Point group: C2
Amino acid sequence: VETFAFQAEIAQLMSLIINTFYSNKEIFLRELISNSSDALDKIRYESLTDPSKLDSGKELHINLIPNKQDRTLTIVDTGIGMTKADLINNLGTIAKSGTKAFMEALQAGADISMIGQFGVGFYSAYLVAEKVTVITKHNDDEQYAWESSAGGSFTVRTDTGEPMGRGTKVILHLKEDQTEYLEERRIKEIVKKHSQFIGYPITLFVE
Amino acid sequence: VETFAFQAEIAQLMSLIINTFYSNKEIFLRELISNSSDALDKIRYESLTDPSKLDSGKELHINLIPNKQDRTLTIVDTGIGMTKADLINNLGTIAKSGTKAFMEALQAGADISMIGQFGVGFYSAYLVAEKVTVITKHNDDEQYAWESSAGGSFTVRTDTGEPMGRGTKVILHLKEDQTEYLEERRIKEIVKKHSQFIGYPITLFVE
């Protein structure tokens, strides 16, 4: 297990997300689904000129999996996935410059819901999760698990868990007061509100 | 000069954009600036692990250049640019699947302004342009000019014009009744309305 320090700007972003009073927490799900859609677009685009890109899986979809026993909400996609280098480099984001632009935007009257416009919407997971685990598999690398309970550090290890073929799994270990996002009708409401026109099938699993 | 037929779905998209009555045409500029921002994000991200990616130019910006004599509005960026293969493959988009999802969305009550959510916002240029010329330079390829007045076909040729270093230039040859988008105060209004928080400097050139 390798342990890394977040760059200062990302640690600041995460602390802001965790500590700022902001009731409209539901946007985390929109942001994660949007990320999954972007990843699915990328592998689709690559497959247009190289069909073998889909040998690791032809299905392009997003699954939402609540588990009340574990108190986890998992967002799974069969998108392009992330390399180890991607994971370490702020999960494929330009988080340093993105965080700066987001802060500058917040200064000029923006609010936290606009986070995704700055390329750092992943970190909105910390609106509802005390810990986030990301399992990912990219065609050009092995399967890795990234994890962080914030507080300035994350871990990366090779994943010996269930193989995924290709894509990303975001596991949200929810805060004790945020279990509403495990309820079927709440998830359905949020998906209909914010992600109605996403161009990949979104399947909400039942328990 | 090589001439190509648009895939059927893209020809349909373009005809819909050209022929549908829709007064809110200004969104084209938001969509092109968004594309430029995405391209700038991509070269930024690549440069994080490979600084030499910026040997073709360190500046990351967007320029808006009106020219009333030529009746053109040009959007220039120093983003990642496009390879020849990218240009031919619907300017780096998943236009076939994107167009389908956009149509399905329009069926379920969406309107043309949401085009960018489906990865085909480039084609909104045809709300205001009778012809569009795209000059582009990607680190891994030569400089190319793509062009189309719609009507089912586009051309690609090697560009012998002014070298660009790296990025993309979208030249909008405006319709005779759409010259308002050459006026400084109109462009400023649209940028402030729709692109206020874009994380790269946007410079509106004067004439």
